Amino acid sequence: LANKFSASTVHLEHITTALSCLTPFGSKDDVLIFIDADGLSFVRENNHVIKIQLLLSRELFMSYSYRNETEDHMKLCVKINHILDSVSVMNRNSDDIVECTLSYDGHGSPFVLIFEDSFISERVEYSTYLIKDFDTNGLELDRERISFEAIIKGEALHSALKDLKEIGCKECYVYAKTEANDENVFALISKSQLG
Amino acid sequence: MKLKLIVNGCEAPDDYKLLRTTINTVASLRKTAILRFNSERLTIISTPKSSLNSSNNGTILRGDTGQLWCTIPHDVFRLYTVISARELNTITMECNCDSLLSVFKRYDRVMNQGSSSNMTIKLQSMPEWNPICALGITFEEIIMHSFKVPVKLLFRAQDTRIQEPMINYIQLMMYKLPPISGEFGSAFHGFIRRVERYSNVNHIHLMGVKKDDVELKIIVNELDWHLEICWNGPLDSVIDISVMVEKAEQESSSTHEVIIRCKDWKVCSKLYAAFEEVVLAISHDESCVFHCSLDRGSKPRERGQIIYYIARSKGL
């Protein structure tokens, strides 16, 4: 395509999964989209205290073209509510959608999303906004001063988070300790109405 | 003023379906409908310029400008006795749509039950009450069910003021819609009704662009995000204080666009679902015409026609 960025895929699960993951950061706020040859990233921040970055690499798309030359990456800002409503209305017939294409033509142009079916194509253009002065890179891990590291199975952590949510947890404490004989202790301690 | 008509649904079901669709459309469009019984065909009109309809002031209050015209050849009725001393033995009347719709619904129920009787329609002078007469309708039910409907006859002067809208054919782009019974019929039916998924959308922008050699798009700009719905399947093109409306200059010689109301589009979708041969005509920034044609042959017979004219809801 003639656009500066154009990526098309046949797996609609990735997009809806990304929106689902971004939802907990607020149904009505801004989302930053970073585009580069490596891939496309969604970034959200809350209260200057928490940040989420979800990456979609080239491999996830059956076609991926990034023709920009002046800049190695492109930054834009959109409203999450617009995308959420548009996708919810367009994704009602999820069984029939066969292709999804994202496109962008640089600063001053909208972010274009096209759902292509067998005979019907729906094209939506999202207006873009100036990016806030706050830098997403500000909140980052100091790779040279790690206090501790741990690897956990997704299912167990998700179950623990569910349990904490169901008891109305108000404060959380991550406790990590190591001893000899390969003894390890990782725990989550919750302060809630239960105590 | 003898208007003896016999209607049978077991013979030529296409004509009965056409009549049912016509009455349903006129009932859903306006409260009252005009019936013109000529020596050759019956014309059913739903227009805001009628004496009864104009009593609602629809045009000024809600912009009810669309006009529905339906033609039924005399061959539809088993018996067609229409004798008059007017031009071409024409008799004009105005009737209420709800009563006719209820009577036809009862007839449909009786037919579905298993009866194969015929409906006799005549004009009668009711002594109970532009004199007002009654439409005596009767039919057997395997019991002689008879119902009467008020009707108001019209004069020649009143009749002549109701004239079918015409369009500038030379400045008019027509598209032959895919047949509903075809493999693409379901796809086009879904494409037409797609915009209904957005409740808050009131106006839709229809666009037609050359280069199956043309394409049709529905644009919605009432939402927080611009929306375009495109049809990529096959689609063939057929080859006082009053002032004229202002027309925006066409972007190109091969693009025709018009903005219309969503209700008119729903009516067009229903009409498209009803019939097989449908043509959509656009007069750029002027109007949209939905023409449903039913073809029957024996010496080809008369073609059943339903033409719905929709004026633009907004300027371009």
Short mmCIF file of C-alpha atoms in Angstrom, two decimals:
data_model
loop_
_atom_site.label_atom_id
_atom_site.label_comp_id
_atom_site.label_asym_id
_atom_site.label_seq_id
_atom_site.Cartn_x
_atom_site.Cartn_y
_atom_site.Cartn_z
CA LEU A 1 0.00 0.00 0.00
CA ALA A 2 0.97 3.66 -0.39
CA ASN A 3 0.62 4.28 3.36
CA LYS A 4 3.68 4.84 5.53
CA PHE A 5 2.57 1.90 7.70
CA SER A 6 0.24 -0.95 6.74
CA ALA A 7 -0.17 -4.29 8.53
CA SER A 8 -2.79 -6.92 7.73
CA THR A 9 -3.60 -10.12 9.63
CA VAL A 10 -6.15 -12.93 9.58
CA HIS A 11 -6.11 -13.60 13.35
CA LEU A 12 -8.66 -11.31 15.02
CA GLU A 13 -7.92 -12.90 18.41
CA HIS A 14 -4.73 -10.88 18.93
CA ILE A 15 -6.46 -7.50 18.56
CA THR A 16 -9.36 -8.31 20.87
CA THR A 17 -6.96 -9.86 23.39
CA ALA A 18 -4.84 -6.69 23.37
CA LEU A 19 -7.91 -4.51 23.93
CA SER A 20 -9.02 -6.81 26.76
CA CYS A 21 -5.60 -6.53 28.40
CA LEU A 22 -5.63 -2.73 28.04
CA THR A 23 -9.17 -2.35 29.42
CA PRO A 24 -8.26 -2.46 33.16
CA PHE A 25 -6.35 0.83 32.70
CA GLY A 26 -9.60 2.75 32.14
CA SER A 27 -12.42 2.51 29.61
CA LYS A 28 -12.17 6.27 28.86
CA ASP A 29 -8.59 7.52 28.50
CA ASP A 30 -5.73 7.71 25.99
CA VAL A 31 -3.59 4.99 24.41
CA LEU A 32 -0.20 5.53 22.77
CA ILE A 33 0.66 3.57 19.62
CA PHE A 34 4.33 3.10 18.69
CA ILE A 35 5.09 1.78 15.20
CA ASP A 36 8.46 0.52 13.99
CA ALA A 37 9.95 -2.15 11.74
CA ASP A 38 10.09 -4.51 14.73
CA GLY A 39 6.36 -4.18 15.36
CA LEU A 40 3.51 -2.20 16.89
CA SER A 41 3.14 -1.46 20.61
CA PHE A 42 0.24 -0.17 22.71
CA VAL A 43 1.17 1.81 25.82
CA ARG A 44 -1.02 3.08 28.65
CA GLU A 45 -0.25 4.82 31.94
CA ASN A 46 -2.27 5.49 35.09
CA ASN A 47 -1.69 8.21 37.69
CA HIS A 48 2.04 8.46 36.86
CA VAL A 49 2.38 5.32 38.99
CA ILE A 50 1.62 2.35 36.71
CA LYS A 51 2.37 1.60 33.05
CA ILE A 52 1.53 -1.20 30.60
CA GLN A 53 3.14 -1.93 27.23
CA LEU A 54 1.79 -4.67 24.94
CA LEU A 55 3.81 -5.61 21.85
CA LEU A 56 2.68 -7.14 18.54
CA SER A 57 5.67 -8.28 16.50
CA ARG A 58 5.89 -8.61 12.72
CA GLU A 59 5.34 -12.37 12.82
CA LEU A 60 1.77 -11.98 14.10
CA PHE A 61 0.75 -10.27 10.82
CA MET A 62 0.57 -12.06 7.48
CA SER A 63 1.61 -8.74 5.91
CA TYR A 64 3.63 -5.93 7.51
CA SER A 65 5.05 -2.87 5.74
CA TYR A 66 6.81 0.07 7.41
CA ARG A 67 8.01 2.38 4.63
CA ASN A 68 8.94 5.42 6.74
CA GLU A 69 12.50 6.63 6.09
CA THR A 70 12.94 9.97 7.88
CA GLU A 71 12.04 8.47 11.28
CA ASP A 72 12.72 4.94 12.51
CA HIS A 73 9.44 4.97 14.48
CA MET A 74 6.08 6.73 14.58
CA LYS A 75 4.18 7.81 17.70
CA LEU A 76 0.46 8.54 17.88
CA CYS A 77 -2.26 8.87 20.51
CA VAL A 78 -5.87 7.67 20.27
CA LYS A 79 -8.88 7.36 22.58
CA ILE A 80 -9.52 3.89 23.97
CA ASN A 81 -13.29 4.39 24.12
CA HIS A 82 -13.50 5.07 20.38
CA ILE A 83 -11.63 1.88 19.48
CA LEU A 84 -13.57 -0.14 22.05
CA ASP A 85 -16.99 0.97 20.79
CA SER A 86 -16.02 0.62 17.12
CA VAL A 87 -14.62 -2.88 17.58
CA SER A 88 -17.56 -3.98 19.74
CA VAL A 89 -20.05 -2.92 17.07
CA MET A 90 -17.96 -4.25 14.17
CA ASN A 91 -16.99 -7.50 15.92
CA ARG A 92 -20.60 -8.59 16.51
CA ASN A 93 -20.33 -11.06 13.60
CA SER A 94 -16.97 -12.44 14.68
CA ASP A 95 -17.50 -15.66 12.70
CA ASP A 96 -17.60 -13.88 9.32
CA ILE A 97 -14.64 -11.49 9.67
CA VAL A 98 -11.69 -12.89 7.73
CA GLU A 99 -9.15 -10.05 7.62
CA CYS A 100 -8.14 -7.03 9.71
CA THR A 101 -5.82 -4.29 8.46
CA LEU A 102 -4.29 -1.37 10.36
CA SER A 103 -2.84 1.61 8.51
CA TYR A 104 -1.24 4.96 9.26
CA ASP A 105 0.09 7.75 7.03
CA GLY A 106 2.10 9.79 9.53
CA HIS A 107 1.43 12.79 11.72
CA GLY A 108 -1.73 14.67 10.76
CA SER A 109 -3.57 11.59 9.43
CA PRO A 110 -6.01 9.28 11.24
CA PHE A 111 -5.31 5.75 12.41
CA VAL A 112 -7.23 3.53 9.97
CA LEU A 113 -8.71 0.14 10.87
CA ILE A 114 -10.42 -2.02 8.24
CA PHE A 115 -12.38 -5.22 8.85
CA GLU A 116 -12.55 -7.14 5.56
CA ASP A 117 -15.22 -9.82 5.12
CA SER A 118 -16.03 -12.01 2.11
CA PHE A 119 -17.98 -9.23 0.37
CA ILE A 120 -18.29 -6.36 2.90
CA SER A 121 -15.46 -4.18 4.24
CA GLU A 122 -15.86 -1.73 7.13
CA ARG A 123 -13.33 1.10 7.37
CA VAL A 124 -13.01 3.30 10.47
CA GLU A 125 -10.67 6.26 10.96
CA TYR A 126 -9.68 7.30 14.49
CA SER A 127 -8.60 10.89 15.07
CA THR A 128 -5.21 11.33 16.74
CA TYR A 129 -4.21 13.69 19.55
CA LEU A 130 -1.04 15.33 20.82
CA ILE A 131 1.02 13.13 23.14
CA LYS A 132 1.28 14.24 26.76
CA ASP A 133 4.60 15.58 28.02
CA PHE A 134 4.86 12.65 30.44
CA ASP A 135 7.43 10.16 29.15
CA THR A 136 6.47 6.49 29.15
CA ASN A 137 10.16 5.57 29.52
CA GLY A 138 10.29 7.42 32.85
CA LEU A 139 8.79 4.48 34.76
CA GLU A 140 11.23 1.65 34.03
CA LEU A 141 13.16 -1.02 35.89
CA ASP A 142 16.79 -0.22 36.75
CA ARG A 143 18.36 -3.27 35.13
CA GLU A 144 21.54 -2.87 37.21
CA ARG A 145 19.86 -2.80 40.65
CA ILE A 146 17.45 -5.75 40.72
CA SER A 147 16.49 -6.56 44.30
CA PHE A 148 14.96 -9.90 43.31
CA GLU A 149 13.74 -11.95 40.36
CA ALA A 150 11.23 -14.79 40.08
CA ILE A 151 9.55 -16.94 37.42
CA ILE A 152 5.98 -18.15 38.00
CA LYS A 153 3.39 -20.15 36.09
CA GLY A 154 0.57 -18.06 34.67
CA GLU A 155 -2.28 -20.20 36.01
CA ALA A 156 -1.14 -20.08 39.64
CA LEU A 157 -0.54 -16.32 39.63
CA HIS A 158 -3.89 -15.71 37.94
CA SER A 159 -5.64 -17.83 40.58
CA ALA A 160 -3.87 -15.92 43.36
CA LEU A 161 -4.94 -12.61 41.82
CA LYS A 162 -8.52 -13.88 41.57
CA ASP A 163 -8.46 -14.86 45.24
CA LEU A 164 -7.10 -11.46 46.25
CA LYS A 165 -9.77 -9.69 44.19
CA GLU A 166 -12.60 -11.80 45.63
CA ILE A 167 -11.71 -10.94 49.25
CA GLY A 168 -11.64 -7.19 48.59
CA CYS A 169 -7.88 -6.89 49.04
CA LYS A 170 -6.83 -3.31 49.78
CA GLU A 171 -3.06 -3.59 50.29
CA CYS A 172 -0.66 -6.15 48.80
CA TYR A 173 2.81 -7.19 49.96
CA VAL A 174 5.11 -9.29 47.79
CA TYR A 175 7.45 -11.32 50.02
CA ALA A 176 10.49 -13.07 48.52
CA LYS A 177 13.08 -15.04 50.48
CA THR A 178 15.74 -17.62 49.62
CA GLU A 179 17.67 -20.11 51.75
CA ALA A 180 20.00 -23.07 51.25
CA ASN A 181 18.98 -26.56 50.06
CA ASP A 182 17.11 -24.85 47.19
CA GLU A 183 14.51 -23.48 49.62
CA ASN A 184 12.45 -20.59 48.25
CA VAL A 185 9.53 -18.61 49.66
CA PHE A 186 7.43 -16.36 47.42
CA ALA A 187 4.17 -15.12 48.90
CA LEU A 188 1.50 -12.45 48.53
CA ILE A 189 0.16 -10.98 51.78
CA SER A 190 -3.12 -9.07 51.59
CA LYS A 191 -4.63 -6.52 53.97
CA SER A 192 -8.41 -6.40 53.51
CA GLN A 193 -11.63 -6.41 55.52
CA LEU A 194 -10.77 -10.00 56.46
CA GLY A 195 -7.60 -8.70 58.12
CA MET B 1 -69.53 3.32 -9.80
CA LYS B 2 -69.05 -0.45 -9.96
CA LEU B 3 -65.62 -1.61 -8.74
CA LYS B 4 -66.09 -5.37 -8.70
CA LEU B 5 -62.81 -7.18 -8.03
CA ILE B 6 -62.03 -10.84 -7.31
CA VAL B 7 -58.77 -11.72 -5.54
CA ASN B 8 -57.44 -15.28 -5.30
CA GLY B 9 -54.17 -16.27 -3.65
CA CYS B 10 -54.01 -19.84 -4.95
CA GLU B 11 -53.51 -18.63 -8.55
CA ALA B 12 -50.45 -16.55 -9.43
CA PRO B 13 -49.08 -16.20 -5.87
CA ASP B 14 -46.58 -13.61 -7.11
CA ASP B 15 -49.35 -11.08 -7.75
CA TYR B 16 -50.85 -11.70 -4.30
CA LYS B 17 -47.43 -11.23 -2.70
CA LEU B 18 -46.96 -8.00 -4.66
CA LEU B 19 -50.33 -6.67 -3.48
CA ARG B 20 -49.60 -7.68 0.12
CA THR B 21 -46.22 -5.94 0.02
CA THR B 22 -47.77 -2.82 -1.50
CA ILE B 23 -50.45 -2.57 1.18
CA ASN B 24 -47.92 -3.25 3.95
CA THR B 25 -45.57 -0.56 2.62
CA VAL B 26 -48.31 2.06 2.30
CA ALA B 27 -49.61 1.21 5.78
CA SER B 28 -46.13 1.51 7.31
CA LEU B 29 -45.36 4.73 5.40
CA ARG B 30 -48.46 6.90 5.95
CA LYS B 31 -51.86 6.63 7.59
CA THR B 32 -53.95 6.94 4.41
CA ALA B 33 -53.43 5.79 0.83
CA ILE B 34 -54.89 6.79 -2.54
CA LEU B 35 -56.33 4.13 -4.86
CA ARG B 36 -56.74 4.88 -8.58
CA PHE B 37 -58.76 2.25 -10.47
CA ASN B 38 -58.14 2.64 -14.20
CA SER B 39 -59.46 0.47 -17.02
CA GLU B 40 -55.94 -1.00 -17.35
CA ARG B 41 -54.26 -1.05 -13.93
CA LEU B 42 -54.66 -0.10 -10.27
CA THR B 43 -52.30 2.52 -8.85
CA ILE B 44 -51.72 2.76 -5.09
CA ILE B 45 -50.21 6.04 -3.87
CA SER B 46 -48.66 6.99 -0.53
CA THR B 47 -47.86 10.71 -0.71
CA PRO B 48 -47.95 13.60 1.78
CA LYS B 49 -49.87 15.78 -0.70
CA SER B 50 -53.12 13.86 -0.17
CA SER B 51 -56.02 15.59 1.56
CA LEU B 52 -55.93 13.26 4.58
CA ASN B 53 -52.13 13.01 4.81
CA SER B 54 -51.58 16.76 4.49
CA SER B 55 -53.72 17.17 7.62
CA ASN B 56 -50.72 15.90 9.64
CA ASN B 57 -48.30 18.63 8.46
CA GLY B 58 -45.63 15.97 8.13
CA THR B 59 -43.49 17.83 5.59
CA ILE B 60 -42.87 20.88 7.77
CA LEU B 61 -42.60 19.04 11.11
CA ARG B 62 -40.56 15.90 10.31
CA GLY B 63 -39.68 16.20 6.61
CA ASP B 64 -41.90 13.34 5.39
CA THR B 65 -41.32 13.93 1.68
CA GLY B 66 -40.89 10.41 0.30
CA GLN B 67 -43.50 9.14 -2.14
CA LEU B 68 -44.47 5.51 -2.79
CA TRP B 69 -46.17 4.51 -6.05
CA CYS B 70 -47.29 0.96 -6.86
CA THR B 71 -48.79 -0.41 -10.08
CA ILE B 72 -50.90 -3.58 -10.27
CA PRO B 73 -52.02 -4.84 -13.71
CA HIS B 74 -55.69 -5.74 -14.02
CA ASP B 75 -54.66 -9.35 -14.71
CA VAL B 76 -53.91 -9.71 -10.99
CA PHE B 77 -57.63 -9.74 -10.17
CA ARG B 78 -59.68 -12.64 -11.50
CA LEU B 79 -62.54 -10.24 -12.28
CA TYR B 80 -61.95 -6.55 -13.07
CA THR B 81 -65.24 -4.65 -13.49
CA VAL B 82 -64.40 -0.93 -13.41
CA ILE B 83 -66.78 1.27 -15.43
CA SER B 84 -66.69 5.07 -15.28
CA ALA B 85 -67.41 8.15 -17.38
CA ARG B 86 -64.01 9.76 -16.65
CA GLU B 87 -60.75 9.69 -18.58
CA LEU B 88 -59.90 6.04 -19.29
CA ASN B 89 -62.70 5.04 -16.90
CA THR B 90 -60.65 6.16 -13.90
CA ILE B 91 -62.00 6.24 -10.34
CA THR B 92 -59.99 7.86 -7.55
CA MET B 93 -60.46 7.26 -3.83
CA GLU B 94 -58.73 7.72 -0.48
CA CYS B 95 -58.73 4.95 2.13
CA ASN B 96 -57.34 4.23 5.58
CA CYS B 97 -54.44 1.78 5.55
CA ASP B 98 -54.96 0.15 8.96
CA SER B 99 -58.35 -1.39 8.12
CA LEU B 100 -57.16 -2.75 4.77
CA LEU B 101 -54.03 -4.15 6.43
CA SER B 102 -56.13 -5.88 9.10
CA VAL B 103 -58.50 -7.34 6.50
CA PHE B 104 -55.60 -8.64 4.41
CA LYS B 105 -53.93 -10.10 7.51
CA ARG B 106 -57.15 -11.95 8.31
CA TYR B 107 -57.29 -13.19 4.72
CA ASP B 108 -53.69 -14.39 4.97
CA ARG B 109 -54.49 -16.22 8.20
CA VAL B 110 -57.51 -17.89 6.59
CA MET B 111 -55.46 -18.89 3.54
CA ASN B 112 -52.71 -20.34 5.74
CA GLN B 113 -55.37 -22.30 7.65
CA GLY B 114 -56.17 -24.20 4.45
CA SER B 115 -59.03 -22.34 2.80
CA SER B 116 -58.99 -21.70 -0.95
CA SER B 117 -61.84 -19.20 -1.29
CA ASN B 118 -61.87 -15.88 -3.16
CA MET B 119 -62.22 -12.30 -1.92
CA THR B 120 -64.92 -10.15 -3.52
CA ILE B 121 -64.43 -6.37 -3.30
CA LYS B 122 -67.13 -3.87 -4.26
CA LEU B 123 -68.05 -0.24 -3.64
CA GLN B 124 -71.22 0.39 -1.64
CA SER B 125 -73.17 3.37 -0.28
CA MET B 126 -73.51 2.87 3.47
CA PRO B 127 -76.69 4.53 4.81
CA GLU B 128 -75.12 4.91 8.27
CA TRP B 129 -73.10 7.97 7.19
CA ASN B 130 -66.86 14.25 -1.34
CA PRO B 131 -69.41 11.67 -0.19
CA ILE B 132 -68.05 8.81 1.93
CA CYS B 133 -68.71 5.24 0.76
CA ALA B 134 -67.70 1.77 1.96
CA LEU B 135 -65.49 -0.95 0.48
CA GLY B 136 -67.52 -4.12 0.89
CA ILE B 137 -65.04 -7.00 1.15
CA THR B 138 -66.30 -10.55 1.59
CA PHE B 139 -64.88 -14.06 1.50
CA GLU B 140 -65.72 -17.60 2.58
CA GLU B 141 -63.95 -19.44 5.40
CA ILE B 142 -64.21 -23.24 5.52
CA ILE B 143 -69.16 -18.92 6.97
CA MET B 144 -69.31 -15.74 4.87
CA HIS B 145 -66.93 -13.26 6.52
CA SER B 146 -67.75 -9.70 5.44
CA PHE B 147 -66.04 -6.46 6.45
CA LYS B 148 -66.48 -2.85 5.32
CA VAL B 149 -63.94 -0.03 5.18
CA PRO B 150 -64.69 3.71 4.89
CA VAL B 151 -63.49 5.42 1.72
CA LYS B 152 -63.69 8.94 0.29
CA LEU B 153 -64.10 9.44 -3.45
CA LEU B 154 -62.16 12.18 -5.22
CA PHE B 155 -62.99 14.57 -8.04
CA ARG B 156 -61.12 15.06 -11.31
CA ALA B 157 -59.59 18.32 -10.04
CA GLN B 158 -58.46 16.65 -6.81
CA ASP B 159 -57.20 13.61 -8.73
CA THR B 160 -55.09 15.56 -11.22
CA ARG B 161 -53.14 17.39 -8.49
CA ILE B 162 -51.58 14.07 -7.40
CA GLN B 163 -48.83 13.61 -9.99
CA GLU B 164 -46.00 11.09 -9.79
CA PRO B 165 -42.57 12.70 -9.25
CA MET B 166 -40.21 12.39 -12.20
CA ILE B 167 -36.41 12.57 -12.28
CA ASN B 168 -33.84 13.89 -14.75
CA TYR B 169 -33.02 10.55 -16.36
CA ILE B 170 -29.97 11.87 -18.22
CA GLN B 171 -28.57 13.23 -14.93
CA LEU B 172 -29.22 10.06 -12.95
CA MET B 173 -26.97 7.09 -12.13
CA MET B 174 -28.65 3.68 -11.86
CA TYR B 175 -27.31 0.47 -10.32
CA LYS B 176 -28.85 -2.98 -10.75
CA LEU B 177 -28.94 -4.59 -7.32
CA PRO B 178 -28.07 -8.31 -7.13
CA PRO B 179 -31.16 -10.53 -7.02
CA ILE B 180 -32.19 -11.44 -3.49
CA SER B 181 -32.68 -15.09 -4.49
CA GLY B 182 -29.11 -15.24 -5.81
CA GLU B 183 -26.04 -16.44 -3.95
CA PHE B 184 -25.11 -12.82 -3.17
CA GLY B 185 -28.62 -11.94 -2.01
CA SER B 186 -27.92 -12.62 1.66
CA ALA B 187 -24.65 -10.67 1.48
CA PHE B 188 -26.33 -7.60 -0.01
CA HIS B 189 -29.24 -7.87 2.44
CA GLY B 190 -26.78 -7.81 5.33
CA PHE B 191 -24.87 -4.95 3.71
CA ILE B 192 -28.02 -2.83 3.45
CA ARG B 193 -29.04 -3.51 7.07
CA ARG B 194 -25.53 -3.07 8.50
CA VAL B 195 -26.05 0.59 9.42
CA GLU B 196 -28.96 -0.46 11.65
CA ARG B 197 -26.38 -1.68 14.18
CA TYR B 198 -25.75 2.00 15.09
CA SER B 199 -28.84 3.23 16.94
CA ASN B 200 -27.79 6.90 17.09
CA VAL B 201 -27.23 7.20 13.32
CA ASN B 202 -29.97 9.28 11.67
CA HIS B 203 -28.57 10.14 8.22
CA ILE B 204 -26.55 7.97 5.83
CA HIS B 205 -24.43 9.16 2.89
CA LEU B 206 -24.83 6.88 -0.13
CA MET B 207 -22.04 7.09 -2.70
CA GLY B 208 -21.58 5.39 -6.06
CA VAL B 209 -18.28 5.41 -7.96
CA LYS B 210 -17.34 4.00 -11.35
CA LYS B 211 -14.87 1.14 -11.03
CA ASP B 212 -19.09 -5.42 -12.15
CA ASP B 213 -17.70 -1.99 -13.02
CA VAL B 214 -18.95 0.29 -10.19
CA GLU B 215 -19.04 0.30 -6.39
CA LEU B 216 -21.49 1.46 -3.72
CA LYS B 217 -20.58 2.80 -0.27
CA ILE B 218 -22.50 3.90 2.83
CA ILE B 219 -20.77 6.62 4.87
CA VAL B 220 -21.63 7.53 8.47
CA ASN B 221 -20.11 10.69 9.96
CA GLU B 222 -22.43 11.15 12.96
CA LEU B 223 -20.27 9.02 15.28
CA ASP B 224 -17.09 10.01 17.12
CA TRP B 225 -15.18 8.14 14.38
CA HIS B 226 -15.67 8.20 10.61
CA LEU B 227 -17.31 5.02 9.29
CA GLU B 228 -17.43 3.63 5.75
CA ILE B 229 -19.18 0.42 4.66
CA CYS B 230 -18.21 -0.78 1.19
CA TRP B 231 -19.70 -3.47 -1.05
CA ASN B 232 -16.97 -5.45 -2.81
CA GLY B 233 -19.23 -8.00 -4.50
CA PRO B 234 -20.54 -7.93 -8.05
CA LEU B 235 -22.81 -5.03 -8.98
CA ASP B 236 -23.90 -4.02 -12.49
CA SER B 237 -24.95 -0.56 -13.66
CA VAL B 238 -27.90 -0.12 -16.03
CA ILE B 239 -26.98 1.78 -19.19
CA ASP B 240 -44.81 31.88 -4.10
CA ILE B 241 -41.57 31.53 -2.12
CA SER B 242 -40.38 28.29 -3.75
CA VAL B 243 -36.84 28.12 -5.12
CA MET B 244 -34.67 25.37 -6.57
CA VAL B 245 -32.49 23.48 -4.10
CA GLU B 246 -28.75 24.15 -4.18
CA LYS B 247 -26.65 21.31 -5.60
CA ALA B 248 -23.03 20.80 -4.60
CA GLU B 249 -20.59 20.47 -7.50
CA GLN B 250 -19.83 16.82 -8.23
CA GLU B 251 -16.34 15.70 -7.25
CA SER B 252 -16.02 13.84 -10.56
CA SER B 253 -18.17 12.99 -13.56
CA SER B 254 -18.39 9.33 -12.44
CA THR B 255 -19.31 9.75 -8.75
CA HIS B 256 -22.86 10.26 -7.48
CA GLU B 257 -23.68 10.88 -3.82
CA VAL B 258 -26.72 11.74 -1.71
CA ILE B 259 -27.55 11.97 2.00
CA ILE B 260 -30.83 10.38 3.13
CA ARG B 261 -32.63 9.37 6.32
CA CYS B 262 -32.20 5.96 7.93
CA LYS B 263 -35.95 5.26 7.91
CA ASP B 264 -36.06 5.60 4.13
CA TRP B 265 -33.14 3.18 3.95
CA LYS B 266 -35.00 0.66 6.12
CA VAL B 267 -38.00 0.97 3.79
CA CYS B 268 -35.68 0.38 0.83
CA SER B 269 -34.21 -2.68 2.55
CA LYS B 270 -37.68 -4.13 3.14
CA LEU B 271 -38.62 -3.49 -0.49
CA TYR B 272 -35.40 -5.14 -1.69
CA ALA B 273 -36.09 -8.18 0.47
CA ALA B 274 -39.64 -8.38 -0.90
CA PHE B 275 -38.90 -8.37 -4.64
CA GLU B 276 -36.27 -9.88 -6.96
CA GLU B 277 -35.36 -7.21 -9.54
CA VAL B 278 -34.35 -3.99 -7.77
CA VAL B 279 -32.72 -0.86 -9.21
CA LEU B 280 -31.21 1.93 -7.11
CA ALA B 281 -31.03 5.32 -8.84
CA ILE B 282 -29.16 8.33 -7.44
CA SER B 283 -29.56 11.95 -8.56
CA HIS B 284 -26.46 13.63 -7.14
CA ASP B 285 -27.32 15.77 -4.11
CA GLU B 286 -30.95 15.55 -5.26
CA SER B 287 -32.73 12.26 -4.53
CA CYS B 288 -32.72 8.46 -4.38
CA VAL B 289 -35.19 6.19 -6.20
CA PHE B 290 -35.82 2.54 -5.32
CA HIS B 291 -37.48 0.71 -8.23
CA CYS B 292 -38.68 -2.87 -7.69
CA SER B 293 -39.89 -4.63 -10.84
CA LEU B 294 -41.76 -7.92 -11.17
CA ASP B 295 -41.77 -9.52 -14.62
CA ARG B 296 -44.46 -11.93 -15.82
CA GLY B 297 -45.04 -13.36 -19.29
CA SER B 298 -47.51 -15.54 -21.15
CA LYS B 299 -47.06 -11.59 -25.67
CA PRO B 300 -45.29 -10.25 -22.57
CA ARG B 301 -47.60 -9.09 -19.79
CA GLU B 302 -47.51 -5.81 -17.89
CA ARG B 303 -44.59 -5.33 -15.51
CA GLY B 304 -45.43 -4.79 -11.85
CA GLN B 305 -43.68 -1.69 -10.53
CA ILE B 306 -43.01 -0.18 -7.11
CA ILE B 307 -41.18 3.16 -7.14
CA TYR B 308 -40.13 4.84 -3.89
CA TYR B 309 -38.82 8.40 -4.23
CA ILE B 310 -36.74 9.75 -1.34
CA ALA B 311 -35.68 13.39 -1.19
CA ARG B 312 -32.32 14.30 0.29
CA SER B 313 -32.28 14.75 4.06
CA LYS B 314 -29.30 17.14 3.99
CA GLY B 315 -27.32 19.08 1.43
CA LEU B 316 -23.84 18.03 0.34
#
